[PDB]
Design a protein around this motif. Structure first.
Motif, PDB file in Angstrom:
ATOM      1  N   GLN A  44       0.798  -1.306   0.057  1.00 19.74           N
ATOM      2  CA  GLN A  44      -0.073  -0.094  -0.178  1.00 19.74           C
ATOM      3  C   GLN A  44       0.939   1.241   0.003  1.00 19.74           C
ATOM      4  O   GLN A  44       0.577   2.300  -0.839  1.00 19.74           O
ATOM      5  CB  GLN A  44      -0.940  -0.097   1.175  1.00 19.74           C
ATOM      6  CG  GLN A  44      -2.087  -1.151   1.258  1.00 19.74           C
ATOM      7  CD  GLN A  44      -2.946  -0.805  -0.161  1.00 19.74           C
ATOM      8  OE1 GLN A  44      -3.208   0.212  -0.614  1.00 19.74           O
ATOM      9  NE2 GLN A  44      -3.272  -2.069  -0.474  1.00 19.74           N
ATOM     10  N   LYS A  45       2.052   1.296   0.645  1.00 23.00           N
ATOM     11  CA  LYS A  45       2.892   2.395   0.742  1.00 23.00           C
ATOM     12  C   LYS A  45       3.564   2.623  -0.645  1.00 23.00           C
ATOM     13  O   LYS A  45       3.436   3.699  -1.049  1.00 23.00           O
ATOM     14  CB  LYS A  45       4.047   2.035   1.864  1.00 23.00           C
ATOM     15  CG  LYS A  45       3.255   2.388   3.137  1.00 23.00           C
ATOM     16  CD  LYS A  45       4.388   2.270   4.416  1.00 23.00           C
ATOM     17  CE  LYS A  45       3.892   2.445   5.785  1.00 23.00           C
ATOM     18  NZ  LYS A  45       4.536   2.329   6.938  1.00 23.00           N
ATOM     19  N   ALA A  46       4.223   1.511  -1.386  1.00 23.00           N
ATOM     20  CA  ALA A  46       4.683   1.523  -2.662  1.00 23.00           C
ATOM     21  C   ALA A  46       3.630   2.284  -3.501  1.00 23.00           C
ATOM     22  O   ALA A  46       4.390   2.673  -4.532  1.00 23.00           O
ATOM     23  CB  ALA A  46       5.370   0.305  -2.711  1.00 23.00           C
ATOM     24  N   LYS A  47       2.647   1.940  -3.418  1.00 24.24           N
ATOM     25  CA  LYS A  47       1.655   2.693  -4.285  1.00 24.24           C
ATOM     26  C   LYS A  47       1.447   4.269  -4.118  1.00 24.24           C
ATOM     27  O   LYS A  47       1.438   5.000  -5.084  1.00 24.24           O
ATOM     28  CB  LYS A  47       0.272   2.254  -4.360  1.00 24.24           C
ATOM     29  CG  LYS A  47       0.181   0.521  -4.921  1.00 24.24           C
ATOM     30  CD  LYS A  47      -1.140  -0.081  -5.057  1.00 24.24           C
ATOM     31  CE  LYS A  47      -0.931  -1.541  -5.538  1.00 24.24           C
ATOM     32  NZ  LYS A  47      -2.517  -2.259  -5.856  1.00 24.24           N
ATOM     33  N   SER A  48       1.350   4.565  -2.731  1.00 23.30           N
ATOM     34  CA  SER A  48       1.133   5.965  -2.204  1.00 23.30           C
ATOM     35  C   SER A  48       2.338   6.949  -2.418  1.00 23.30           C
ATOM     36  O   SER A  48       2.116   7.937  -2.231  1.00 23.30           O
ATOM     37  CB  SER A  48       0.777   5.661  -0.742  1.00 23.30           C
ATOM     38  OG  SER A  48       1.872   5.723   0.107  1.00 23.30           O
ATOM     39  N   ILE A  49       3.534   6.582  -2.867  1.00 19.65           N
ATOM     40  CA  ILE A  49       4.807   7.486  -2.738  1.00 19.65           C
ATOM     41  C   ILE A  49       4.549   8.673  -3.619  1.00 19.65           C
ATOM     42  O   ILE A  49       4.368   8.528  -4.904  1.00 19.65           O
ATOM     43  CB  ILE A  49       5.986   6.614  -3.445  1.00 19.65           C
ATOM     44  CG1 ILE A  49       6.318   5.224  -2.569  1.00 19.65           C
ATOM     45  CG2 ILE A  49       7.211   7.406  -3.207  1.00 19.65           C
ATOM     46  CD1 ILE A  49       6.518   5.290  -1.212  1.00 19.65           C
ATOM     47  N   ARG A  50       4.803   9.825  -2.847  1.00 20.01           N
ATOM     48  CA  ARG A  50       4.742  11.141  -3.398  1.00 20.01           C
ATOM     49  C   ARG A  50       6.213  11.562  -4.287  1.00 20.01           C
ATOM     50  O   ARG A  50       7.177  11.055  -3.703  1.00 20.01           O
ATOM     51  CB  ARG A  50       4.309  12.203  -2.728  1.00 20.01           C
ATOM     52  CG  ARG A  50       4.192  13.442  -3.164  1.00 20.01           C
ATOM     53  CD  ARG A  50       3.411  14.559  -2.156  1.00 20.01           C
ATOM     54  NE  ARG A  50       2.990  15.839  -3.218  1.00 20.01           N
ATOM     55  CZ  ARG A  50       3.630  16.536  -3.635  1.00 20.01           C
ATOM     56  NH1 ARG A  50       4.954  16.883  -3.474  1.00 20.01           N
ATOM     57  NH2 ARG A  50       2.941  17.634  -4.349  1.00 20.01           N
TER      58      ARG A  50
END
Ligand code: MG
Length: 84
Positions: A1-7
């Motif tokens: 989920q974090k790896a999709k959310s990266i800004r």
DNA sequence: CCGACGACAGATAATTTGTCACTGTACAGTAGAATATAGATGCGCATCTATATAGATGCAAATTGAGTGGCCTTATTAAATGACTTCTCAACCAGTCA
């Protein structure tokens, strides 16, 4: 989920280097140095002059990279083509 | 004299509004389209029908030509015309006379 959310940050200030498929970067120095273009569908169904459904137009935009000003458009039912 | 409640004034956080800084997310060729069904309409082809017969036949008058049957004064004479039949059709010798 974090790896999709990266800004990602962004170009900051007056300096901009556009990366190509050749691994070369184009240094964008001034207005009309690098224009850009691609196509997309608009998200509205249009009608003919009689009020019957046609289709969703295609929009093309030409932008200058240095200023981000929209330097031209084409809007139509026509297909992406080297003509458009 | 002591306790409780209302008037008026004063101070205060909750509420609302505004401003400011940091941020998740869409931009990335794309749902009009495919696939059944019922229900009505139209063109084509067949399958009867009802009318319309002219030719053939039977029959019944209407003559039509061709038959057949029934009813009638007679005997003499004379003339006329036209016919038939019968009969007949020798040849030289012997006695006068101008
Ligand atoms: Mg594109």
């Amino acid at each position: 989920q974090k790896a999709k959310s990266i800004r990602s940050p962004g170009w900051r200030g007056t300096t901009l280097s556009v990366k190509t498929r050749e691994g070369k970067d184009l240094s964008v120095d001034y207005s009309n140095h690098v224009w850009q273009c691609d196509h997309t569908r608009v998200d509205v169904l249009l009608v003919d002059q009689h009020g019957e459904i046609l289709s969703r137009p295609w929009l093309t935009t030409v932008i200058d990279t240095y200023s981000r000003c929209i330097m031209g458009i084409n809007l139509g039912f026509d297909a992406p083509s080297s003509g458009v």
